[PDB]
Amino acid sequence: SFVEMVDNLRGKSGQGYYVEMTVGSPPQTLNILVDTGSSNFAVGAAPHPFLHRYYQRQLSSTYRDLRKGVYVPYTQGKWEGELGTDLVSIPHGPNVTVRANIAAITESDKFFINGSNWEGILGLAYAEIARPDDSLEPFFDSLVKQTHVPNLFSLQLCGASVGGSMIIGGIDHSLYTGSLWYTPIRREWYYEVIIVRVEINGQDLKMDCKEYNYDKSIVDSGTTNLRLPKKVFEAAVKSIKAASSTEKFPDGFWLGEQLVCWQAGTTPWNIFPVISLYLMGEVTNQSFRITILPQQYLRPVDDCYKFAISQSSTGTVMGAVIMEGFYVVFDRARKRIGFAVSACHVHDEFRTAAVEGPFVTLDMEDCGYN
Ligand SMILES: CCCCNC(=O)[C@H](C)C[C@H](O)[C@H](CC(C)C)NC(=O)[C@H](CCSC)NC(=O)CCC(C)C
């Protein structure tokens, strides 16, 4: 069953997690980044300095041209290309073949990463944010429509090269401990959720909770950092600075530009606070929390680190540094996202990442931004 899909992801820290796929007939093998923050399936289809291989449409007998161009901008990076369809498989996934939409990337800017080892992107979010428009059926919708694969998938992203699992069509219980806690998908475009409270080392940030979700909060496996709205970012950095005031850092560290180092084995983990994000729950006035350790938001790059919390102008993004602590279930069928402590969690001496509940939280709907 699902055991065949365990450990089917690889990657390099800060460079994304990818799964192996094949496109075309005969099968062309490519590594494809798993991106829950977008909805287009696209692959390099022309030579590029950072590509070791790419998709060759002329060598595939099942390729069909859709005679339509396409462009996709991301927070950082963008590409343009030609739309078409072809047959697609996932060797370490379910045993099926689907005809899916594919954008053949012909030109790009700051999209491909040198040394990343992936040549394409699998947008796993909903058609609502697909380009050129929502009539271009995303890959997972095609998968579910053409096969018996159930309408959900789950991601276990493991940090300190790295690996993980994408379980397509279900949940593998060997991959997490404790209970799964679910938060509603507020609207099916991004995987949008609602954050209802934030605490740092047990102290409430005490902001209007709308600020936490201004102008949206999303879960994105294709973003490295925890990215926070301007006002929230400032409050969070202020609190984290105060907790670590014992030591002194370059001011470019807090902007993610400069790294800090310590002698191997002497990283003062203790002076950096835990961060708790409370998410809206499944019953009235009920929430739960996920707690993040400094080992997650200080990304290893003697031991040197970069600050992996950064400022956003497009809402909160819960990226890899959040997901790495957890097993995350994208339960599209029941419009909810589940969190549990991952089997591959990192080890702090006196502290542990957690998913805990129930909590009572009043007026949660008012935390959503309009
Ligand atoms: C068309 C409408 C949908 C657009 N969606 C997005 O822009 C989502 C929010 C972001 C998307 O996941 C892209 C993926 C990347 C591979 C280009 N990520 C980024 O732009 C982010 C920008 C971070 S700003 C410090 N890139 C990274 O974190 C670097 C690591 C990645 C190579 C894994």
Swiss-Prot record:
Keywords, A to Z?
Acetylation, Aspartyl protease, Cell membrane, Cell projection, Cytoplasmic vesicle, Disulfide bond, Endoplasmic reticulum, Endosome, Glycoprotein, Golgi apparatus, Hydrolase, Isopeptide bond, Lipoprotein, Lysosome, Membrane, Palmitate, Phosphoprotein, Protease, Signal, Transmembrane, Transmembrane helix, Ubl conjugation, Zymogen
Q: Where is the Peptidase A1 domain?
A: 38-340
Is the keyword Glycoprotein assigned to this protein?
Answer: yes
GO molecular function terms noted in the UniProt entry: amyloid-beta binding; aspartic-type endopeptidase activity; beta-aspartyl-peptidase activity; endopeptidase activity; enzyme binding; peptidase activity; protein serine/threonine kinase binding
Q: Where in the cell is it found?
A: Cell membrane; Golgi apparatus, trans-Golgi network; Endoplasmic reticulum; Endosome
Q: What does the activity regulation annotation say? A: Inhibited by RTN3 and RTN4.
Summary of the tissues where the protein is detected:
Expressed at high levels in the brain and pancreas. In the brain, expression is highest in the substantia nigra, locus coruleus and medulla oblongata.
PTM comment for this protein? Answer: N-Glycosylated. Addition of a bisecting N-acetylglucosamine by MGAT3 blocks lysosomal targeting, further degradation and is required for maintaining stability under stress conditions.
Taken from the record's topology, the Extracellular segments are: 38-370
Q: How changing D215N affects the protein?
A: Almost abolishes beta-cleaved soluble APP production
What protein name does the entry list?
Answer: Beta-secretase 1
Q: What are the leading ranks of the lineage?
A: Eukaryota, Metazoa, Chordata, Craniata, Vertebrata
List the active site. D220
Q: At which residues is N6-acetyllysine found?
A: K68, K206, K210, K216, K230, K231, K238
